[PDB]
Design an enzyme around this catalytic site. Sequence first.
Site, PDB file in Angstrom:
ATOM      1  N   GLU A   1       8.560 -33.878  -0.081  1.00 40.43           N
ATOM      2  CA  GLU A   1       7.342 -33.326  -0.658  1.00 40.43           C
ATOM      3  C   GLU A   1       7.629 -32.532  -1.925  1.00 40.43           C
TER       4      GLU A   1
ATOM      5  N   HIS B   1       0.785  -1.231   0.000  1.00 44.84           N
ATOM      6  CA  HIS B   1       0.000   0.000   0.000  1.00 44.84           C
ATOM      7  C   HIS B   1       0.822   1.290   0.000  1.00 44.84           C
TER       8      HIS B   1
ATOM      9  N   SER C   1      -0.129  -0.996  -6.061  1.00 38.29           N
ATOM     10  CA  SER C   1       0.136  -2.338  -6.588  1.00 38.29           C
ATOM     11  C   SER C   1       0.926  -2.125  -7.887  1.00 38.29           C
TER      12      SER C   1
ATOM     13  N   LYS D   1     -13.172  -9.782  -9.026  1.00 39.06           N
ATOM     14  CA  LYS D   1     -12.084 -10.514  -9.642  1.00 39.06           C
ATOM     15  C   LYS D   1     -11.474 -11.491  -8.651  1.00 39.06           C
ATOM     16  N   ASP D   2     -11.355 -11.113  -7.388  1.00 44.43           N
ATOM     17  CA  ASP D   2     -10.804 -12.059  -6.440  1.00 44.43           C
ATOM     18  C   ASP D   2     -11.802 -13.167  -6.194  1.00 44.43           C
TER      19      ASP D   2
HETATM   20  C1  HEM Z   1       2.307 -14.966   2.787  1.00 45.14           C
HETATM   21  C2  HEM Z   1       1.618 -15.104   1.635  1.00 45.14           C
HETATM   22  C3  HEM Z   1       1.530 -14.023   0.820  1.00 45.14           C
HETATM   23  C4  HEM Z   1       0.432 -13.364   0.661  1.00 45.14           C
HETATM   24  C5  HEM Z   1      -0.885 -13.840   1.265  1.00 45.14           C
HETATM   25  C6  HEM Z   1       0.818 -12.206  -0.160  1.00 45.14           C
HETATM   26  C7  HEM Z   1      -0.019 -11.205  -0.539  1.00 45.14           C
HETATM   27  C8  HEM Z   1       0.255 -10.265  -1.468  1.00 45.14           C
HETATM   28  C9  HEM Z   1      -0.779  -9.580  -2.169  1.00 45.14           C
HETATM   29  C10 HEM Z   1      -2.236  -9.892  -2.237  1.00 45.14           C
HETATM   30  C11 HEM Z   1      -0.245  -8.726  -2.954  1.00 45.14           C
HETATM   31  C12 HEM Z   1      -1.069  -7.836  -3.893  1.00 45.14           C
HETATM   32  C13 HEM Z   1      -0.826  -7.940  -5.390  1.00 45.14           C
HETATM   33  C14 HEM Z   1      -0.835  -9.379  -5.859  1.00 45.14           C
HETATM   34  O1  HEM Z   1      -1.819 -10.084  -5.558  1.00 45.14           O
HETATM   35  O2  HEM Z   1       0.135  -9.810  -6.520  1.00 45.14           O
HETATM   36  C15 HEM Z   1       1.149  -9.040  -2.831  1.00 45.14           C
HETATM   37  C16 HEM Z   1       2.064  -8.417  -3.569  1.00 45.14           C
HETATM   38  C17 HEM Z   1       3.323  -8.785  -3.597  1.00 45.14           C
HETATM   39  N1  HEM Z   1       3.787  -9.876  -2.904  1.00 45.14           N
HETATM   40 FE1  HEM Z   1       2.930 -11.041  -1.790  1.00 45.14          FE
HETATM   41  N2  HEM Z   1       2.097 -12.246  -0.633  1.00 45.14           N
HETATM   42  C18 HEM Z   1       2.524 -13.388  -0.019  1.00 45.14           C
HETATM   43  C19 HEM Z   1       3.748 -13.893  -0.220  1.00 45.14           C
HETATM   44  C20 HEM Z   1       4.664 -13.318  -1.012  1.00 45.14           C
HETATM   45  C21 HEM Z   1       5.912 -13.962  -1.298  1.00 45.14           C
HETATM   46  C22 HEM Z   1       6.429 -15.290  -0.702  1.00 45.14           C
HETATM   47  C23 HEM Z   1       6.607 -13.112  -2.034  1.00 45.14           C
HETATM   48  C24 HEM Z   1       7.979 -13.221  -2.179  1.00 45.14           C
HETATM   49  C25 HEM Z   1       8.656 -13.324  -3.349  1.00 45.14           C
HETATM   50  C26 HEM Z   1       5.692 -12.015  -2.274  1.00 45.14           C
HETATM   51  C27 HEM Z   1       5.963 -10.956  -3.077  1.00 45.14           C
HETATM   52  C28 HEM Z   1       5.074  -9.945  -3.385  1.00 45.14           C
HETATM   53  C29 HEM Z   1       5.355  -8.869  -4.334  1.00 45.14           C
HETATM   54  C30 HEM Z   1       6.664  -8.620  -5.087  1.00 45.14           C
HETATM   55  C31 HEM Z   1       4.275  -8.074  -4.389  1.00 45.14           C
HETATM   56  C32 HEM Z   1       4.230  -6.656  -4.962  1.00 45.14           C
HETATM   57  C33 HEM Z   1       4.186  -6.331  -6.450  1.00 45.14           C
HETATM   58  C34 HEM Z   1       2.832  -6.562  -7.103  1.00 45.14           C
HETATM   59  O3  HEM Z   1       1.820  -6.780  -6.400  1.00 45.14           O
HETATM   60  O4  HEM Z   1       2.780  -6.499  -8.342  1.00 45.14           O
HETATM   61  N3  HEM Z   1       4.481 -12.143  -1.664  1.00 45.14           N
HETATM   62  N4  HEM Z   1       1.450 -10.089  -2.023  1.00 45.14           N
HETATM   63  C1  LIG Z   2     -11.212  -8.377   8.515  1.00 45.97           C
HETATM   64  C2  LIG Z   2     -10.690  -8.605   7.065  1.00 45.97           C
HETATM   65  C3  LIG Z   2      -9.643  -7.498   6.570  1.00 45.97           C
HETATM   66  C4  LIG Z   2      -9.172  -7.812   5.077  1.00 45.97           C
HETATM   67  C5  LIG Z   2      -7.733  -8.412   5.078  1.00 45.97           C
HETATM   68  C6  LIG Z   2      -7.013  -8.857   3.706  1.00 45.97           C
HETATM   69  C7  LIG Z   2      -7.038  -7.660   2.723  1.00 45.97           C
HETATM   70  O1  LIG Z   2      -5.630  -7.196   2.427  1.00 45.97           O
HETATM   71  O2  LIG Z   2      -7.647  -8.168   1.403  1.00 45.97           O
HETATM   72  C8  LIG Z   2      -6.877  -8.152   0.113  1.00 45.97           C
HETATM   73  C9  LIG Z   2      -6.783  -6.758  -0.054  1.00 45.97           C
HETATM   74  C10 LIG Z   2      -5.474  -8.774  -0.045  1.00 45.97           C
HETATM   75  N1  LIG Z   2      -5.196  -8.597  -1.437  1.00 45.97           N
HETATM   76  C11 LIG Z   2      -5.394  -7.427  -2.035  1.00 45.97           C
HETATM   77  O3  LIG Z   2      -5.828  -6.374  -1.427  1.00 45.97           O
HETATM   78  C12 LIG Z   2      -5.138  -7.274  -3.507  1.00 45.97           C
HETATM   79  C13 LIG Z   2      -4.227  -6.281  -3.958  1.00 45.97           C
HETATM   80  C14 LIG Z   2      -3.990  -6.107  -5.389  1.00 45.97           C
HETATM   81  C15 LIG Z   2      -4.657  -6.921  -6.355  1.00 45.97           C
HETATM   82  C16 LIG Z   2      -5.564  -7.918  -5.899  1.00 45.97           C
HETATM   83  N2  LIG Z   2      -6.246  -8.738  -6.801  1.00 45.97           N
HETATM   84  C17 LIG Z   2      -5.719  -9.203  -7.871  1.00 45.97           C
HETATM   85  O4  LIG Z   2      -6.332  -9.112  -8.884  1.00 45.97           O
HETATM   86  C18 LIG Z   2      -5.805  -8.101  -4.518  1.00 45.97           C
HETATM   87  O5  LIG Z   2      -6.679  -9.062  -4.188  1.00 45.97           O
HETATM   88  C19 LIG Z   2      -5.445 -10.263   0.323  1.00 45.97           C
HETATM   89  O6  LIG Z   2      -4.103 -10.790   0.051  1.00 45.97           O
HETATM   90  O7  LIG Z   2      -5.739 -10.486   1.757  1.00 45.97           O
HETATM   91  C20 LIG Z   2      -4.841  -9.794   2.659  1.00 45.97           C
HETATM   92  C21 LIG Z   2      -3.636 -10.327   2.806  1.00 45.97           C
HETATM   93  C22 LIG Z   2      -5.557  -9.414   4.024  1.00 45.97           C
HETATM   94  O8  LIG Z   2      -5.838 -10.536   4.909  1.00 45.97           O
HETATM   95  C23 LIG Z   2      -4.779 -11.268   5.427  1.00 45.97           C
HETATM   96  O9  LIG Z   2      -4.008 -10.392   6.165  1.00 45.97           O
HETATM   97  C24 LIG Z   2      -5.398 -12.331   6.309  1.00 45.97           C
HETATM   98  C25 LIG Z   2      -4.314 -13.264   6.951  1.00 45.97           C
HETATM   99  C26 LIG Z   2      -3.503 -12.521   7.821  1.00 45.97           C
HETATM  100  C27 LIG Z   2      -5.037 -14.296   7.794  1.00 45.97           C
HETATM  101  C1  LIG Z   3      11.049 -26.295  13.205  1.00 45.69           C
HETATM  102  C2  LIG Z   3      11.791 -25.808  12.002  1.00 45.69           C
HETATM  103  C3  LIG Z   3      13.111 -25.928  11.734  1.00 45.69           C
HETATM  104  C4  LIG Z   3      14.123 -26.603  12.638  1.00 45.69           C
HETATM  105  C5  LIG Z   3      13.735 -25.404  10.499  1.00 45.69           C
HETATM  106  C6  LIG Z   3      13.727 -26.013   9.289  1.00 45.69           C
HETATM  107  C7  LIG Z   3      13.820 -25.333   7.992  1.00 45.69           C
HETATM  108  C8  LIG Z   3      13.065 -25.570   6.926  1.00 45.69           C
HETATM  109  C9  LIG Z   3      13.391 -25.239   5.503  1.00 45.69           C
HETATM  110  C10 LIG Z   3      12.867 -23.829   5.190  1.00 45.69           C
HETATM  111  C11 LIG Z   3      12.813 -26.266   4.481  1.00 45.69           C
HETATM  112  C12 LIG Z   3      13.144 -27.703   4.925  1.00 45.69           C
HETATM  113  C13 LIG Z   3      13.280 -25.986   3.015  1.00 45.69           C
HETATM  114  C14 LIG Z   3      12.146 -26.293   2.049  1.00 45.69           C
HETATM  115  C15 LIG Z   3      14.582 -26.643   2.531  1.00 45.69           C
HETATM  116  C16 LIG Z   3      15.490 -25.479   2.097  1.00 45.69           C
HETATM  117  C17 LIG Z   3      14.458 -27.733   1.376  1.00 45.69           C
HETATM  118  C18 LIG Z   3      15.111 -29.128   1.666  1.00 45.69           C
HETATM  119  C19 LIG Z   3      14.331 -30.410   2.029  1.00 45.69           C
HETATM  120  O1  LIG Z   3      15.200 -31.447   1.999  1.00 45.69           O
HETATM  121  C20 LIG Z   3      14.814 -32.765   2.282  1.00 45.69           C
HETATM  122  C21 LIG Z   3      15.779 -33.743   2.230  1.00 45.69           C
HETATM  123  O2  LIG Z   3      17.069 -33.351   1.886  1.00 45.69           O
HETATM  124  C22 LIG Z   3      15.434 -35.114   2.508  1.00 45.69           C
HETATM  125  O3  LIG Z   3      16.456 -36.030   2.420  1.00 45.69           O
HETATM  126  C23 LIG Z   3      16.121 -37.377   2.697  1.00 45.69           C
HETATM  127  C24 LIG Z   3      14.104 -35.461   2.859  1.00 45.69           C
HETATM  128  C25 LIG Z   3      13.100 -34.484   2.931  1.00 45.69           C
HETATM  129  O4  LIG Z   3      11.749 -34.785   3.286  1.00 45.69           O
HETATM  130  C26 LIG Z   3      11.362 -36.131   3.587  1.00 45.69           C
HETATM  131  C27 LIG Z   3      13.476 -33.112   2.638  1.00 45.69           C
HETATM  132  C28 LIG Z   3      12.524 -32.040   2.668  1.00 45.69           C
HETATM  133  O5  LIG Z   3      11.322 -32.192   2.958  1.00 45.69           O
HETATM  134  C29 LIG Z   3      13.019 -30.632   2.346  1.00 45.69           C
HETATM  135  C30 LIG Z   3      11.961 -29.599   2.419  1.00 45.69           C
END
Ligand code: HEM
Ligand SMILES: CCCCC[C@H]1C(=O)O[C@@H](C)[C@H](NC(=O)c2cccc(NC=O)c2O)C(=O)O[C@H](C)[C@@H]1OC(=O)CC(C)C
Ligand SMILES: C/C=C(C)/C=C/C=C/[C@H](C)[C@H](C)[C@H](C)[C@H](C)CCc1oc2c(O)c(OC)cc(OC)c2c(=O)c1C
Lengths: 49, 379, 100, 241, 48, 59, 66, 49, 78
Positions: free
Chosen positions: B271, B201, B205, B227-228
């Site tokens: 996995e 925010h 976006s 859309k969502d």
């Molecule tokens: C924990 C789960 C995650 C949720 C629920 C989440 C949620 C969001 C949402 C909804 C947006 C809005 C725009 C869109 O939908 O793309 C967003 C944007 C973005 N998230 Fe996440 N995200 C998550 C994980 C991640 C992860 C793992 C990455 C890491 C690479 C990431 C990178 C981004 C980026 C780069 C944007 C901004 C740019 C854009 O929206 O075009 N997010 N994320």
């Molecule tokens: C009481 C409820 C409050 C609403 C909370 C809820 C709120 O951010 O809802 C949307 C906006 C959020 N994504 C977007 O806004 C969004 C942004 C750009 C484009 C799109 N669409 C693509 O076309 C989106 O959909 C979506 O990713 O959920 C989040 C992350 C959050 O909720 C999460 O914390 C919940 C987790 C913490 C349990």
């Molecule tokens: C409580 C949490 C603690 C201690 C921290 C742990 C950290 C977790 C990290 C992010 C996780 C494994 C990542 C996906 C890593 C990089 C990938 C590697 C990874 O390696 C494996 C592996 O070498 C195996 O050899 C037989 C068997 C496996 O499963 C049966 C896995 C496995 O499941 C994952 C996945």
Amino acid sequence: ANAGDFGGYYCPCHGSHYDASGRIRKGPAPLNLEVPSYEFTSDDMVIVG
Amino acid sequence: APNIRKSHPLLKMINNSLIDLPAPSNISAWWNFGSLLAVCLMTQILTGLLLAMHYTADTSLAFSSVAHTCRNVQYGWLIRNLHANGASFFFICIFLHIGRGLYYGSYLYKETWNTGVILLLTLMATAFVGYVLPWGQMSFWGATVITNLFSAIPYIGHTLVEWAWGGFSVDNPTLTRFFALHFLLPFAIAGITIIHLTFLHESGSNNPLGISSDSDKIPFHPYYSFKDILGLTLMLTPFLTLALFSPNLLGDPENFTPANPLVTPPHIKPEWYFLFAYAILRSIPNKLGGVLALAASVLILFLIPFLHKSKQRTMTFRPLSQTLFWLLVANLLILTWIGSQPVEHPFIIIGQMASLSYFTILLILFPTIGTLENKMLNY
Amino acid sequence: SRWLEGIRKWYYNAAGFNKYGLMRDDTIYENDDVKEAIRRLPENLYDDRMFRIKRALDLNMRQQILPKEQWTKYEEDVPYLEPYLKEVIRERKEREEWDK
Amino acid sequence: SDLELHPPSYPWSHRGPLSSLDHTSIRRGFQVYKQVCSSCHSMDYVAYRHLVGVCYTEDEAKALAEEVEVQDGPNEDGEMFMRPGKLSDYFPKPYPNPEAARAANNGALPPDLSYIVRARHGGEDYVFSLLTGYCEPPTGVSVREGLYFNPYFPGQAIGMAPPIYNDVLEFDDGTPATMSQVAKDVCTFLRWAAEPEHDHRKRMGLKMLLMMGLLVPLVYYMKRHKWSVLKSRKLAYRPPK
Amino acid sequence: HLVGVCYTEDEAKALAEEVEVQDGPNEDGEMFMRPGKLSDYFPKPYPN
Amino acid sequence: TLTARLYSLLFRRTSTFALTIVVGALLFERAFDQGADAIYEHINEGKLWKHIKHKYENK
Amino acid sequence: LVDPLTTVREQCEQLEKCVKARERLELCDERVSSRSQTEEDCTEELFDFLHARDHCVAHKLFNSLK
Amino acid sequence: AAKNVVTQFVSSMSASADVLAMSKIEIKLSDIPEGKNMAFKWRGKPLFV
Amino acid sequence: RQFGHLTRVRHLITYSLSPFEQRPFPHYFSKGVPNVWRRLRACILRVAPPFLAFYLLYTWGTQEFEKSKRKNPAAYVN
Ligand code: HEM
Ligand SMILES: CCCCC[C@H]1C(=O)O[C@@H](C)[C@H](NC(=O)c2cccc(NC=O)c2O)C(=O)O[C@H](C)[C@@H]1OC(=O)CC(C)C
Ligand SMILES: C/C=C(C)/C=C/C=C/[C@H](C)[C@H](C)[C@H](C)[C@H](C)CCc1oc2c(O)c(OC)cc(OC)c2c(=O)c1C
Ligand code: HEM
Ligand code: HEM
Ligand code: FES
């Protein structure tokens, strides 16, 4: 046991091959298997620890 | 304010993140991934919270408990099914979400991106645990490596592990203390996710063209809300389909055999949503190297923002890096296959190879094809 | 043997950002420099660029593009901002060096 | 040699994403388990309770569970004592503990068949094959004392002797109790056994699919309906000159 | 526990020897008694 | 003319609309199920316990 | 009483592939049991057969089963 | 104050004050003929003889 | 960032119609489907290649493996 390219051991986790002595020969394993403290008490007896 | 939708401390937030939020007009599905990711976070937290209502974290009862939770609790089976699969729909969306972000340089919103990583990491972390919980052959042996995986870190390692998990070997304690982490963690993901969106925010976006959108921007509500809801049902149907027709389709069956501390299954395939990094790990023969590789295998996302050279943001006008990109996405789908594959010449090499293109494509190719394309424009 | 000229032409049509009908410069990500650059733009070209971007967006948002006719031709692409942007940069590089 | 043979696919009566289990077949599948596998193969996660309404009748299963005595709680003087198996008991364990079983089955551990079908890739297809599929080891290959060759099993040497031949029992319904036949019925059971939800789960899947079918378009219209404002839209740049 | 609080290692060890405890399955799987180690819990007088 | 009759009477007043969603859902449910159940069962004749329940209750 | 399996394995054991396999095997069998010292095993060959046999065994077996 | 509370709520996990010492096991060497390897249940992890 | 403080936009006339006065359906078969292909054919030659390449590397890899398993009729002709 009874699997691998060194007629000793193989660990299906990451491909470490062991020889019948328990040494690591191929793979990513770092040190050779653990050799516990032990001794034989007779012709057919073996005590570990 | 006669508004209210803006004059109420709480109520505003909503009519400020779901209604009235300025979003780019032009936005592909690749933007839903995230709103979906949420729904997963939910579906996971909801189902799992509910599944924990029947779990019994303790070696002797752990495995069975789940079984009971299925066979005995009404729809308990459905809950489980849904859960284990949400896991995937979760990783899928995340894996795609990262995609999108990568190829529209959404990673330029740095913070919103960095937080993102954290989420991934955690989602990977939390999913590691939990899978231990059912205490199956896999559960156990995964616990034993992944954990032991911190063996590598010198000095503080061997110790950190014999602590990571319970005492000195994955045993009951490790289990209870994992359940706890699992039960806890998701709520962290939720929190950070808030932090994630906050950072977002701050900076609107993105948008597929990678050029200012103030010129357009439509009210989040009327549009994107729908859309969502749509994308909700779309990538909801598969996930459900699985859960009702071929649940274990993605779930290794080997884990259906209660844990045995004495025999790790010949054919331990981690996995799917983990395989890639898995491969990388084994194709670098050296405990440390193995781990290190892995470490960066995922902990590399943090550098993508610095490995951006294109004078343009997204790469829709960068046909060159563009295919380099898919060379990557595929180079990933490869590592994966090579991960679900035993270690023999036909593979292995293929492995460490892709497990080389991976890095290079990122660390080097991209930024090079990057500046290059700029010069093919006099920049 | 192979003209960079001949090449650029390639990339240009390859990038195909002209299919949306916007000049090269209409694309360069907007970083600190560019912003200042564009903020120096004569109001003429500004509103021009704007529309071109909004049109671009509107297209993109419709998934459809501009008739083969309206694409902009490589040779006719107007580097409307490169000049300002450059001064900017050197202006900066001049300052950055002086602060040492 | 990590050389193995992969089990051929049989068109099971319940393979279809929309096809339930042939409950009749399970009934027999049960009997074959009870009468021949439940003497080596424990099946701890099921219980007569289930059979009721799925392949047996209340009174049927009740008297069915009477058929076994179970060790139960402390006396007043506190001492385990046996008593008629009620309806809620779980299928009897053949051995007090594994190592006990291992000492009964030539050093092998007959795995519990609760989740067998989904614990071995191939499920029924595997299991079925395994049963109906023993034979003399080809040449150069020699199975040791106590084991029995079976190509489909990894190692090809199993600790389980072919536990199923023609007539071994007699399906009280009047079914040619041939090996192939019985072996089929055992597998269809092993399935339900592994996941009683099966039917309920697919039926569900059915509906779930009819909702997607119905819901997604609806919201699609709605999504388009709403966007048309933009899809339709038209620009134009009109400066004064 | 007793060790270091009111008894000595060797003291408690021989102290726990003083009782036989039912322990895990044979190979033939059967409860069997054996000398109470150091880690056993104080003996229960009644089975239940 | 259905659609017109519908709008005016049912979809116009946000008060009404909702009311038909409810009474409608009740109808959709009852009907969707019976239909589904039938479609399903029929695709599995003689395999369901409902179908063999009879060799201890005839058919 | 006759097991539809054995009958259907009879037909199947005749399909072109089985034969072109059953043969491939028969040779190997008597190719290994003909020597004193040989590491060869006719497992592979055995499978190829089976693999093929049972494959149709399946395409039809369940038709005669209730 | 903190230093300790930390140390404390950090050992509130490491180890568990529950340690064994089955370091002693008896094996009939005749159970393991020439060419094969038998595995035993010993001290929390497997034992190869 | 909220609304009204986004950009200095001058001279852009936009005309759009109520959704009820227009049709959402849209014009498939006219502009609809056409553009779809206009795209499958545009990126097919930019996406598919690598995937195709993988495939090969997958098959090759698998076959070869499945081969290195079968015996060399001549590892022992004697
Ligand atoms: C924990 C789960 C995650 C949720 C629920 C989440 C949620 C969001 C949402 C909804 C947006 C809005 C725009 C869109 O939908 O793309 C967003 C944007 C973005 N998230 Fe996440 N995200 C998550 C994980 C991640 C992860 C793992 C990455 C890491 C690479 C990431 C990178 C981004 C980026 C780069 C944007 C901004 C740019 C854009 O929206 O075009 N997010 N994320
Ligand atoms: C009481 C409820 C409050 C609403 C909370 C809820 C709120 O951010 O809802 C949307 C906006 C959020 N994504 C977007 O806004 C969004 C942004 C750009 C484009 C799109 N669409 C693509 O076309 C989106 O959909 C979506 O990713 O959920 C989040 C992350 C959050 O909720 C999460 O914390 C919940 C987790 C913490 C349990
Ligand atoms: C409580 C949490 C603690 C201690 C921290 C742990 C950290 C977790 C990290 C992010 C996780 C494994 C990542 C996906 C890593 C990089 C990938 C590697 C990874 O390696 C494996 C592996 O070498 C195996 O050899 C037989 C068997 C496996 O499963 C049966 C896995 C496995 O499941 C994952 C996945
Ligand atoms: C009854 C119809 C029956 C079935 C069904 C059956 C199946 C079965 C499976 C699927 C396995 C093995 C899977 C694997 O890969 O390990 C298995 C294993 C053993 N069985 Fe069995 N079995 C049936 C019946 C019986 C009976 C009556 C006995 C005891 C006489 C028996 C024994 C065993 C044993 C021992 C194994 C061990 C396999 C090994 O470790 O080598 N089975 N059975
Ligand atoms: C962040 C999302 C979550 C992830 C990634 C996740 C993932 C998992 C996974 C993969 C398992 C193993 C399932 C299997 O055996 O296939 C699991 C198990 C479990 N999860 Fe989660 N979980 C999440 C959240 C939750 C939540 C919020 C709770 C409750 C606090 C929870 C409680 C459980 C329970 C009860 C189990 C044990 C039973 C079972 O194995 O299915 N999970 N979780
Ligand atoms: S666990 Fe042995 S190869 Fe890694």
